[PDB]
Amino acid sequence: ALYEDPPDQKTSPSGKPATLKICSWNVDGLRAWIKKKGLDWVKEEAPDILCLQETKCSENKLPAELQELPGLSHQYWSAPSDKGYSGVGLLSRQAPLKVSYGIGDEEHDQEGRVIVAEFDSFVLVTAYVPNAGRGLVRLEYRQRWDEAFRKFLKGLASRKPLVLCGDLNVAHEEIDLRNPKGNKKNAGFTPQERQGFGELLQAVPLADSFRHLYPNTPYAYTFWTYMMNARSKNVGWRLDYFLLSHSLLPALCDSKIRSKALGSDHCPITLYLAL
């Protein structure tokens, strides 16, 4: 039932040393995560790029302790216009060539869920996909968002190879959560949401970085409900992903689940690429 993430492979199949380390983390309340020592974890992990989802913190209440990461000094933030209910961030060692926010339909919406950062040799998207909600009350919104997102990403990755990370709010296959059969009618594992993720991989196309390396590893999760003691009993879901263009698979050194790192009801994930 438990899971121990394999050790970090810092060399590509071709044999190159990893040159870029990206960490993605749903902090589920940036300010509380900061009080639970999340920045201490990040400083130890020392990623070149850090992506954060569900910040639930407006741009103006951002603790200046984030300024205390000069190793990740270029910081971009995407807060909603309506809501602390969502929000995402991207911090990198080097300035991206260009940073954008949203997926094009910010008229009447602007939910604060996506940052697009263009780097020298690839484009990174971080996303906090809308949860379909308890009793699927937001599933219809989720399906329309999936469609727009796929379309938006299609007209993005035809220029440079793409990395996409974040809380995608779906367990793709039954090997991606602990209770598949009790959850087929729950947000994260409906047939429609599993279909959208399949369509995402097909249409862009993207490869699931973790499952590309560990197709047969079970019990690998990145989210556990705070309730019961689901984290302790590894009753989890894998909702957080690094998705890669096929162009990038020969650079893929490893894709980590940082199961032990506390501070949220998700744990960090870490990507190594040899670029």
Residue numbers in the entry: 43 to 125, 127 to 318
Study authors write:
Human APE1 is an essential enzyme and multifunctional nuclease with AP-endonuclease, 3′ phosphodiesterase, 3′ to 5′ exonuclease, and RNA cleavage activities. Here, we utilize enzyme kinetics, X-ray crystallography, and molecular dynamics simulations to provide insight into rAP processing by APE1.
We obtained crystals of both the substrate form (APE1 bound to an uncleaved rAP site) and product form (APE1 bound to a 5′ nicked rAP site), which diffracted to 2.05 and 2.10 Å, respectively. Similar to observations of the substrate structures, the rAP DNA backbone (green) is shifted compared to the corresponding structure with deoxy-AP DNA (grey), presumably due to the restrained sugar pucker of the rAP site. This reveals that the rAP is in the position normally occupied by a Mg2+. Interestingly, with the shift of the rAP phosphate backbone relative to the active site residues, these interactions are broken in the rAP product structure. Instead, the phosphate group oxygens are in position to interact with the residues that compose the metal binding pocket (E96, D70, D308) (green). Importantly, with the phosphate in this pocket, it cannot simultaneously contain the catalytic metal, therefore there is no metal bound in this structure. This highlights the conflict between the rAP and binding of the catalytic metal.
